[PDB]
Amino acid sequence: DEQTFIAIKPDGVQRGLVGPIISRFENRGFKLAALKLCSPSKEHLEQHYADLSSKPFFPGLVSYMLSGPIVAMVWEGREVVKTGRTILGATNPLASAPGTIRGDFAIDVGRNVCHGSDSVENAKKEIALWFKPEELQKYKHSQFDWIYE
Amino acid sequence: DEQTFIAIKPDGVQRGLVGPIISRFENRGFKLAALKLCSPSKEHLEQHYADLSSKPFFPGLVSYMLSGPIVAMVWEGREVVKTGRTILGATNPLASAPGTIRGDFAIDVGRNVCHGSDSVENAKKEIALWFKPEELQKYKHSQFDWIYE
Amino acid sequence: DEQTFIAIKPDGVQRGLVGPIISRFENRGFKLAALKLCSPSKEHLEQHYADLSSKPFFPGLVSYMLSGPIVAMVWEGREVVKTGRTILGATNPLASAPGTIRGDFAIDVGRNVCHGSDSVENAKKEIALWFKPEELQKYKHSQFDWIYE
Amino acid sequence: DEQTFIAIKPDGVQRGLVGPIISRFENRGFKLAALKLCSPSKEHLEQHYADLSSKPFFPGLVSYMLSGPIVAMVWEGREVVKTGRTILGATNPLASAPGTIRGDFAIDVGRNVCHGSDSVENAKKEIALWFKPEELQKYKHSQFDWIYE
Amino acid sequence: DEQTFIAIKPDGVQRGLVGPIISRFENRGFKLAALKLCSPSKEHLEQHYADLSSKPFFPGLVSYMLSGPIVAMVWEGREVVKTGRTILGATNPLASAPGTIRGDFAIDVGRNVCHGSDSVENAKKEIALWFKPEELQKYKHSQFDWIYE
């Protein structure tokens, strides 16, 4: 099935939200295909945020993204990239509904605790960048037929 | 006060969601008038979904509704039927908001963990079909005066 | 596998503890084999506590157990009667046991939120008393092989 | 940074929602600036609801707001008055999204468990009314730099 | 009924544990009689610690006990003083059971998130020291008859 990349940013990790963020995705029926705590290099984060190299916040973003470890995840399921964006809430948490991750945990756009892919095609690009193919796990979910038709 | 019918579907029961769905109705202030785990007959489920005899998904819907036990319930309170639907969410989970049962727990419309009355009319019927008078409980909620004016 | 009878007493139902109590057993991996909200007769309750028919507690214990509706349950799994008691906690909710149901929710031995069989023998007896054979559901937990060796 | 006034109304307190309401604001990363259990005078409550002295519900509102003790709170953070409004949810609980305090806990407008200020200017007046300056705690939030940018 | 004194220490407040700690007392069926966020002087702690000022250590303790705000609480019910100590867990978190506040949240004895009275006569001395008589609220718990016989 469809895959998406979710990262918990350094604020999400330092504020003790790894478990609740993973729960909201487990509880929904999505399957965890990859998971790691990493400290990525600035090259790696410049590639990840390449489409923002242009902008004027990009050096602030990169340097904050360097400021502690990150949890990189792949989640798998029907329409998981789009349903991921709904679970995380609006990029700006002040614009996010309660019951979303940013709606329950975040205030500032620059401490929005989580990153998610904005498309299927950008997800494949982010998964290939953060994970070697061997880190992707191939298993069937114990409750696949209770979750899907 | 007004009554609505809510069923945890086989997927809901088989995924350990019986407690969490009861909690969401209890916590709102709604009163638990009737409750059981049951295995309805093909005939019963065909009567329950009567308005959909027409349609091409109707046989497969019936079979899945037989595929494992169902928790049938009656919740009583001011506009419980309408609020009942808001809590469950849109019948398609991907249209559903986080905060709602389908938005927290479900992906596919064929596995949307819960059925709810579409109206006060249908609620009165679905209650009669699923429950004998002996089984509808008559008691005043301990906290009625704190919940209503 | 083995069975136990558990009932949420009328204090339990009126304090909104049905959801949380069901969750505790669900999450441990016990199977819900029966469930009903019912208002027993007095002879029913008399025969349920028949061992304490003489003892002085009896007529007061009985009148309280009539004060509102009760959730009767059957739970199924390995050693579920003994693990059932561990989860409820000691009869006197000054259990000395936070993490149990009584140790988290209760104070008074006469308002101790739930009843649990003292024994496999007494459970088989109590299950026969409270439930018709039809009400005992026969199905396989979706996750049996991940819960048992 | 911006302050807002939240009160848990007597129904909130009597239903055991103090803990859960406090946790929703904590989890977002708002700073608890002030807190107390108090029973305000009829005269206090009438000045609090001054701009509704002319409305037909006013006399019931005041008597209800006198029917038991209130938890008064000051929460501090970026856009906390507006965000506080979203967290509490619509004044009428039946117009409220699940995932808001009223959306999860309340049914009737006359028992909507919680009060929040309608504006920054309004909140300043409500804080002045309910707390003397010595009850407002000044301190930096341990996680300030992970919450804000 | 009987009263005990429970304080959340500044580690408790700065780690966001006010809501959870209040819930464990609310859910057990104890009645909040007083609540306030305060910053006491090294006078209003001098005699509070008339049993705990001069060990071997406490240039560390009194420095830390005004490192931040304290949430001060009175809780009311049958045996609230011994039950309170049970809920808080052992003074040293590393000898506390999971299910206790300290067992779920603390590590160091010097950051044990919580203080509670050591006896019923100590409670009264600790209550009259932290609270004026007009801060203690007097009201009947909503569920008194479901909590107590």
Place this chain on the structure above:
Amino acid sequence: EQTFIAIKPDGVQRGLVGPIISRFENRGFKLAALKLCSPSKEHLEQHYADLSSKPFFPGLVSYMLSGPIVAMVWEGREVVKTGRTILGATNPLASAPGTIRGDFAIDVGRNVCHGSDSVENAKKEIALWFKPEELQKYKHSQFDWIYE
């Protein structure tokens, strides 16, 4: 001071990753390392090398191949022993309500988690399952609020 924690295939398949992780975050222990991996049987044979002689070994290794495992390093004062208290007894039936096995498991062979038995044990399990690049060196934001 470090300890090794592994969510077993059953723990993953029953959706307990988030819950187990929070029970450690909440206590104030720091997450030094985390990954979802499928170890070789040779990896697992070395992990359980102390039970190489025991009857149930091939069946343990076989079961532990039946899907991915979440491997974790948690850091903090007395984290191996407090790690053991949080997990509960190896037999979930002998386990306190409030512990991970006390809340979520029944059979010893489906006990959702593995903890180090010792500081010494932990050091060997960490060295086996993670390379030193993967152990994250950082100060906990709330360190001074957790420890004297």
